[PDB]
Amino acid sequence: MGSLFRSESMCLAQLFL
């Protein structure tokens, strides 16, 4: 799967900075 968490993490982290 490739750690789906990475897909969501980069989705929020971006707008988090």
Q: Tell me which residue has tokens 């971006």.
A: 14
State the DSSP code for 3: -
Mark out the alpha helices in 1-17 (DSSP H runs). 4-16
Dist CA 17 CA 4 (whole Å): 21
Experimentally, the structure was elucidated by NMR
Dist CA 10 CA 2 (whole Å): 13
